[PDB]
């Protein structure tokens, strides 16, 4: 029994949910209306699909958190809904990294064009990463065969076998490594993109400064969103994994551990409705399409 304020917490999600339910919807018809011109379009479509899946998983999570029995709904949420939410969020991370890589390639190598073979390869890579995330998430959904031993508690860390627990720890370590690699790649590529734009501007325009800061203020928005909403989750993920798998942390530490982990999880889930907003704020064509829709 952490606190009664637990009931207050999924309310944020539904405040996060309803608006999200329309934002991805706004991105559902606009992003898919245009054809697959380049790899960025495919990656953005996959990202909005992942965000829609996040929105689909949210009401189950809020129902489990607010008030629900351990048996009928908590086991179902912890078995598939939670795991699908996690690997879809990892897929969104990977596709954000792919978008950053595509932008870096388009900036550093501007003369290279996107061929049909390049689009086919990008689609193949998307399918491969989707299948990879599904394959790693499958044991996390099939190894939770243990029945709930206790009905009063809602923590589903005991609903998993010893091999299930060791595979869960391996999955956490692998996904932490993947996230760190993707984060460093994104940071490096965005810094290189800003440097390349600055160099191009000083080669062409010279000592101008007014439009040079326009790209700096928009790149930082992506960096800020990817930092303040993904990174604290992975700072707090390792202690939570150690507490769930091992017993190295004591009882009173579990309260603040759960609090910070769940708050960081909410911050991560905010990205589902944040990504449509930032992607519409960045590209002017998306704003034009949204205005024409109204």
């Amino acid at each position: 029994d952490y606190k009664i304020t637990q009931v207050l917490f999924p309310l944020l999600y539904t405040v996060l949910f309803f608006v999200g339910l329309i934002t991805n919807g706004l991105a559902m018809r606009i992003f898919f209306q245009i054809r697959s011109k380049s790899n960025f379009i495919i990656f953005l479509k996959n990202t909005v699909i992942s965000d829609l899946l996040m929105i689909l998983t949210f009401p189950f999570k809020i129902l489990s958190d607010a008030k629900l029995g351990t048996g009928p709904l908590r086991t179902f949420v912890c078995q598939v809904t939670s795991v699908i939410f996690y690997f879809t969020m990892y897929i969104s991370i990977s596709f954000l990294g792919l978008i950053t890589i595509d932008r870096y390639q388009k900036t550093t190598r501007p003369f290279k064009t996107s061929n049909p073979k390049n689009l086919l390869g990008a689609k193949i890579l998307s399918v491969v990463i989707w299948a990879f995330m599904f394959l790693l998430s499958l044991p996390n959904m099939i190894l939770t065969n243990r029945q709930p031993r206790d009905k009063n508690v809602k923590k589903c860390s005991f609903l998993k076998s010893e091999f299930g627990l060791v595979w869960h720890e391996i999955v956490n370590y692998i996904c932490q490594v993947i996230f760190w690699i993707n984060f460093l790649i994104v940071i490096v590529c965005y810094t290189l993109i800003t440097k390349e734009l600055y160099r191009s501007y000083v080669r062409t325009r010279g000592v101008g400064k007014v439009p040079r800061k326009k790209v700096n203020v928009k790149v930082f928005i992506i960096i800020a969103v990817f930092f303040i909403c993904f990174v604290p989750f992975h700072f707090a993920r390792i202690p939570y994994t150690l507490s769930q798998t091992r017993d190295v942390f004591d009882c009173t530490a579990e309260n603040t551990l759960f609090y910070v982990k769940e708050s960081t999880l909410w911050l991560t889930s905010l990205n589902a409705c944040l990504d449509p907003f930032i992607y519409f704020f960045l590209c002017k064509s998306f704003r034009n399409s949204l205005i024409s829709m109204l």
Binding site: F40, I99, P116, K284, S285
Partner: protein, 218 residues
């Protein structure tokens, strides 16, 4: 169905060839030249381009293929064919620095031409590579003739550095967008591999913006 199969095979081969040609065309850079006949437009062509209404000039610089287009021979209405230049990488506008007092002034005629080109519905997102050529002649002509006769708005003193820098700013204020179109201004010189060097950088700058506009960064 042998005839149908042969027709399908021919269509597939034609489609492959057309895709290859389209890739080759998209890899190359298209630039449209605009301005006046006596503004030094032909001076830029006869610099390093070793390789009848349109004068097509093709040259390779740093493993990049360019395609210049000249519309000087088209002595007709511009708006009936200016829409055919959609998707060009940039517009190379050439205006003479020394043509401020030739007579209905030459500078006013170029500004009126530049105003229509820069503020038309066809080149809203197309950058302009402005060229203030013939800067060498501008040095010995600024002292004899000031800019007061062209317009009384020049409160500043008449100097080669001051006038050339200020007359450069006389073209950006004509741009109403100032967000989708960026005007790149350069003064032509006789230095080897220096005038075309700016064009390569200007093309790279607009392409980078174009390569990121569809990528969501703009």
């Amino acid at each position: 169905s042998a005839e149908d199969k042969a027709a399908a095979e021919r269509s597939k081969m034609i489609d492959k060839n057309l895709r290859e040609d389209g890739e080759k065309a998209a890899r190359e850079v298209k630039l449209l030249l605009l301005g006046a006949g006596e503004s030094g437009k032909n001076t830029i062509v006869k610099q390093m381009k070793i390789i009848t209404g349109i004068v097509e000039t093709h040259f390779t610089f740093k493993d990049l293929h360019f395609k210049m287009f000249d519309v000087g021979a088209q002595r007709s209405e511009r708006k009936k064919w200016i829409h055919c230049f959609e998707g060009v990488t940039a517009i190379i506008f050439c205006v003479a620095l020394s043509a401020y007092d030739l007579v209905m002034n030459r500078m006013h005629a170029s500004m009126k031409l530049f105003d229509s080109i820069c503020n038309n519905k066809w080149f809203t997102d197309t950058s302009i590579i402005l060229f203030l050529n013939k800067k060498d002649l501008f040095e010995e002509k600024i002292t004899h003739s000031p800019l007061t006769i062209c317009f009384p708005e020049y409160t500043g003193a008449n100097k080669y550095d001051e006038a050339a820098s200020y007359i450069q700013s006389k073209f950006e204020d004509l741009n109403k967008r100032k967000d989708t179109k960026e005007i790149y201004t350069h003064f032509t010189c006789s230095t080897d591999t220096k005038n075309v060097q700016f064009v390569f950088d200007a093309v790279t700058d607009v392409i980078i913006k174009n390569n990121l506009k569809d990528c969501g960064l703009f």
